[PDB]
Amino acid sequence: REIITLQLGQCGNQIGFEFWKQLCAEHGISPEGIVEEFATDRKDVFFYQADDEHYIPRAVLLDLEPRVIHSILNSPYAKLYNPENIYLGNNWASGFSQGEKIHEDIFDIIDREADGSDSLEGFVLCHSIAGGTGSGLGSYLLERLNDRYPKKLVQTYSVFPNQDEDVVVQPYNSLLTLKRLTQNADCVVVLDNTALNRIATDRLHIQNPSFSQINQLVSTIMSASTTTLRYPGYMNNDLIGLIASLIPTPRLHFLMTGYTPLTTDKTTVLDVMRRLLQPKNVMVSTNHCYIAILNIIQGEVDPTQVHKSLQRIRERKLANFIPWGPASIQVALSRKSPYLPSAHRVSGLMMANHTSISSLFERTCRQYDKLRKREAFLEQFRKEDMFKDNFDEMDTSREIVQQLIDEYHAATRPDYISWG
């Protein structure tokens, strides 16, 4: 039914602003919400059917120390949506304590759109991991969000914060955010700033406006993830229907992203399926092997050859996916979305459960381990001491991330009929 989206932090507000602009550009609408004359499709998934034939997006804005919010304010995309949801540190503990005192008023902002909506389906979170203002605040609000409504779903769009060296408190912040990301979130789509920066320096020669182009990438991914919902499809026209197949085990919910063209500034089915399969078109970067893959295709595609394509990708036999119980790489096929001009027609997006993210988790765990052992980089503040005097929240997150690495590695084993 109806999904309410959330954005917090300056990076999260940037990606949400770009997402709403990019769906305004996709749909046959004006930047005021007025429908165009050439419209149809389903436009109730994130758009409130507002009072002047406006499709107002339902977006929760959360900001602290507003810098980008003024730039969002003086724009012709503030006439598209304005639900009056604006409500005013760089540490996780500081953001946690600042979210502590004002939770009731932003919760009134939540309940306003909750009662304004007739139905509710899920909550999408635009949150920047170790983002300074976003960190701590987003973790606290995530905790209160899943506490209040256990009848809904949570997706969180996350980045892996490390530019490979800078800030020494960031592994603590991302670790505490990762603890809540495990136990208070039901689906996590993780992105790599390193992998996106490498692909941006690959296809182009830009490395300085990286945020602006990464906005374009994430908005395309988020729109392609929702095209079967926003346009009349048949399967996973709800969020939960999409989330259900991918997760065999309720803590194995980390979702890998790839995309079949790399440069965006006739081919057949099994071709782009095979290219989406490769890790060098995967834009997020002992054995590591996939649990289950789901893929969506959108473009000009001849539909009758897909079963022979399915056979050819089968006998090509590219991944030795899993031992114990049988998953698959699973296809979904969609139409290329109308109501806008379309270049680079054949475009695919893949959602996969892969244990290879345990390597990145062990990377930031090793960074935390060396910074904890050296003990000159915790940056002891009264915020962190008053939040936790013995700093055993780090210990709880540490044993939980150990359990998750154990879960990954024992799932990679042929025996996960015993738990571990």
């Binding site: 389903r42 009349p232 499809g233 048949y234 399967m235 026209n237 709800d238």
Partner: protein, 60 residues
Amino acid sequence: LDVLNKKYSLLDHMQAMRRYLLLGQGDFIRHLMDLLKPELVRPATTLYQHNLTGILETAV
């Protein structure tokens, strides 16, 4: 061909038969089973047809 293609239609009429009767649109059947939750799980032999048709007309 032309008399039936302008005082009614043929291809356009058959597409909606595919959408509803053959369940070619999953969204309508999704909200059909959502909104008609109590009337279905409870016997509809104690109930008139006009209630189901009336809730169906708003369901689409």
